[PDB]
């Protein structure tokens, strides 16, 4: 029943929500809606597609100096290893971003040139 939700508006005053869910398995899920149906993405696919990341820099962005907080460290074990388990490929930013474009090509009405 947990989750977080932002409503981001564009400079032309048009909105887009990006709801994050919490799964009881341990992982989290990015949710959006491009047309009148919803779509679910794990956020480590997006954390590694925005910029060129390490995997300790994903850890250091959530964990501050509170490494000894063992609630957060155990829930972040399951988040980063679930990305390596479910997606054993997709190691760098340019490979995660091609998977995310292959799955959202017919729905975002893409062009054959891109």
Partner 1 sequence: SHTFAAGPSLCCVQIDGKIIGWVSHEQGKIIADTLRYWKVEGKTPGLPIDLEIGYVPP
Partner 2 sequence: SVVGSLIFCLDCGDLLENPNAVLGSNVECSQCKAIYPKSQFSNLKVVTTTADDAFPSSLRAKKSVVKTKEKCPQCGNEEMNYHTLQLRSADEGATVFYTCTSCGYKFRTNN
Partner 3 sequence: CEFKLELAADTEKLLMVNIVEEICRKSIIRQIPHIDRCVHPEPENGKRV
CB of 39 to partner 1, least distance (A): 22
- Interface stretch with partner 2, choices 14-22, 34-42, 62-70, 101-109 (CB under 8 A): 62-70
Site string for partner 2, 41-60 (x = CB under 8 A): -------------xxxx-x-
Please say whether the beta carbons of 44 and 79 come within 8 A.
yes
100 close to 64: Cβ distance less than 8 angstroms: no
Query: Is residue 8 within the footprint of partner 1 (CB under 8 A)?
Result: yes
Instruction: State the burial class of residue 96 (Cβ atoms within 10 Å of its Cβ: 0-12, 13-18, 19+).
Output: buried
CB of 6 to partner 1, least distance (A): 7
- Give the full edge-to-edge strand order of the sheet including 28-33: 3-9, 15-22, 28-33, 38-41
- Is 91 one of the binding residues for partner 2 (CB under 8 A)? yes
Judged by CB under 8 A, the chain residues 16 through 75 that form the site for partner 1 are 60-66
For residue 97, report the phi and psi dihedrals to the nearest 5 degrees. Answer: -75, -20
Structure tokens at 83: 């990305």
- Cβ of residue 43: shortest distance to partner 2, in angstroms? 16
| Shortest distance in whole angstroms from residue 76 CB to partner 2 | 8
Alpha-carbon distance of 73 to 100, in angstroms, equals: 27
Q: Which is nearer to partner 1, 28 or 90 (CB)?
A: 28
């Amino acid at each position: 029943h947990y989750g977080i939700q932002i409503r981001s508006v564009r400079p032309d005053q048009t909105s887009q929500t990006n709801v994050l869910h919490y799964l009881n398995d341990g992982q989290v899920t990015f949710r959006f809606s491009w047309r009148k149906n919803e779509y679910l993405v794990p956020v480590v696919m997006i954390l590694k597609a925005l910029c060129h990341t390490s995997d300790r820099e994903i850890f250091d962005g959530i964990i501050g100096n509170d490494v000894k907080d063992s609630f957060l460290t155990d829930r972040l074990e399951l988040l980063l290893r679930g990305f390596k388990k479910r997606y054993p490929h997709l190691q760098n930013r340019t490979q995660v971003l091609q998977y995310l474009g292959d799955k959202f090509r017919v729905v975002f009405q893409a062009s054959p040139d891109q």
